[PDB]
Design a protein around this nucleic acid. Structure first.
Length: 82
DNA sequence: GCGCATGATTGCCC
DNA sequence: GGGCAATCATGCGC
Protein backbone atom coordinates (compact mmCIF):
# COMPACT_ATOMS: atom_id res chain seq x y z
CA UNK A 1 0.00 0.00 0.00
CA UNK A 2 2.62 2.53 1.13
CA UNK A 3 1.95 6.07 2.35
CA UNK A 4 -0.30 7.48 -0.38
CA UNK A 5 -0.70 8.98 -3.86
CA UNK A 6 -4.05 8.02 -5.38
CA UNK A 7 -5.55 4.47 -5.40
CA UNK A 8 -8.57 5.82 -3.50
CA UNK A 9 -10.78 7.86 -5.88
CA UNK A 10 -10.80 5.66 -8.95
CA UNK A 11 -11.42 6.96 -12.48
CA UNK A 12 -15.14 6.76 -11.65
CA UNK A 13 -15.05 9.14 -8.68
CA UNK A 14 -12.86 11.66 -10.50
CA UNK A 15 -15.24 12.06 -13.45
CA UNK A 16 -18.14 12.40 -11.01
CA UNK A 17 -16.63 14.63 -8.32
CA UNK A 18 -15.10 17.11 -10.82
CA UNK A 19 -18.34 17.63 -12.77
CA UNK A 20 -20.05 18.60 -9.52
CA UNK A 21 -16.99 20.49 -8.24
CA UNK A 22 -17.18 22.92 -11.18
CA UNK A 23 -20.59 23.94 -9.77
CA UNK A 24 -19.51 24.88 -6.24
CA UNK A 25 -16.10 26.41 -7.01
CA UNK A 26 -16.84 29.38 -4.73
CA UNK A 27 -17.60 26.66 -2.16
CA UNK A 28 -14.98 23.86 -2.53
CA UNK A 29 -16.96 21.56 -0.25
CA UNK A 30 -19.86 19.15 -1.07
CA UNK A 31 -22.96 18.90 1.15
CA UNK A 32 -24.42 16.17 3.36
CA UNK A 33 -26.46 14.82 0.47
CA UNK A 34 -23.64 15.67 -1.94
CA UNK A 35 -20.98 13.62 -0.16
CA UNK A 36 -23.69 10.97 -0.02
CA UNK A 37 -24.70 10.97 -3.68
CA UNK A 38 -21.10 11.60 -4.75
CA UNK A 39 -19.61 8.89 -2.55
CA UNK A 40 -22.38 6.55 -3.73
CA UNK A 41 -21.95 7.49 -7.35
CA UNK A 42 -18.16 7.59 -7.20
CA UNK A 43 -17.54 4.71 -4.83
CA UNK A 44 -15.81 6.63 -2.06
CA UNK A 45 -16.90 7.72 1.41
CA UNK A 46 -18.44 11.07 2.34
CA UNK A 47 -15.34 12.41 4.14
CA UNK A 48 -13.23 11.41 1.11
CA UNK A 49 -15.28 13.70 -1.11
CA UNK A 50 -14.55 16.77 1.02
CA UNK A 51 -10.94 15.62 0.79
CA UNK A 52 -10.97 15.25 -2.99
CA UNK A 53 -12.86 18.50 -3.61
CA UNK A 54 -10.47 20.60 -1.53
CA UNK A 55 -7.59 19.41 -3.73
CA UNK A 56 -9.44 20.26 -6.95
CA UNK A 57 -9.55 23.98 -6.16
CA UNK A 58 -5.86 23.94 -5.31
CA UNK A 59 -4.81 22.26 -8.56
CA UNK A 60 -7.12 24.83 -10.22
CA UNK A 61 -5.09 27.85 -9.04
CA UNK A 62 -2.14 26.23 -10.83
CA UNK A 63 -3.62 26.32 -14.33
CA UNK A 64 -6.71 28.57 -14.05
CA UNK A 65 -7.41 28.77 -17.81
CA UNK A 66 -7.11 25.00 -17.94
CA UNK A 67 -9.90 24.55 -15.41
CA UNK A 68 -12.05 27.29 -16.91
CA UNK A 69 -12.61 25.57 -20.25
CA UNK A 70 -12.92 22.28 -18.37
CA UNK A 71 -15.45 23.82 -16.03
CA UNK A 72 -17.60 24.42 -19.11
CA UNK A 73 -16.85 20.95 -20.47
CA UNK A 74 -17.76 19.02 -17.33
CA UNK A 75 -20.49 21.53 -16.49
CA UNK A 76 -22.63 20.79 -19.56
CA UNK A 77 -22.44 17.12 -18.55
CA UNK A 78 -24.03 17.63 -15.13
CA UNK A 79 -27.37 16.13 -16.19
CA UNK A 80 -25.66 12.73 -16.53
CA UNK A 81 -26.67 10.08 -13.99
CA UNK A 82 -29.10 11.68 -11.55
C1' DG B 1 15.62 1.77 -14.66
C1' DC B 2 13.99 6.73 -13.38
C1' DG B 3 10.67 9.41 -14.10
C1' DC B 4 6.43 11.34 -15.49
C1' DA B 5 1.19 11.67 -14.13
C1' DT B 6 -2.01 12.14 -9.88
C1' DG B 7 -3.81 12.37 -5.55
C1' DA B 8 -2.81 11.75 -0.39
C1' DT B 9 -0.35 13.01 3.96
C1' DT B 10 0.53 17.65 6.67
C1' DG B 11 0.45 21.81 8.11
C1' DC B 12 -1.08 26.82 7.70
C1' DC B 13 -4.14 31.03 8.07
C1' DC B 14 -5.40 34.98 7.52
C1' DG C 1 -13.48 24.64 12.82
C1' DG C 2 -13.37 24.30 8.07
C1' DG C 3 -11.03 25.06 3.88
C1' DC C 4 -6.91 25.94 1.43
C1' DA C 5 -2.35 24.73 0.62
C1' DA C 6 2.33 22.84 -1.02
C1' DT C 7 5.65 18.58 -1.67
C1' DC C 8 6.01 14.04 -1.76
C1' DA C 9 5.53 9.22 -2.27
C1' DT C 10 2.78 6.25 -4.62
C1' DG C 11 1.47 4.17 -9.23
C1' DC C 12 2.20 2.86 -13.99
C1' DG C 13 4.36 4.33 -17.46
C1' DC C 14 7.89 6.00 -19.89
Amino acid sequence: MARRKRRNFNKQATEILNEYFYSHLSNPYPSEEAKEELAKKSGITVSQVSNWFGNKRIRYKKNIGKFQEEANIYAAKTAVTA
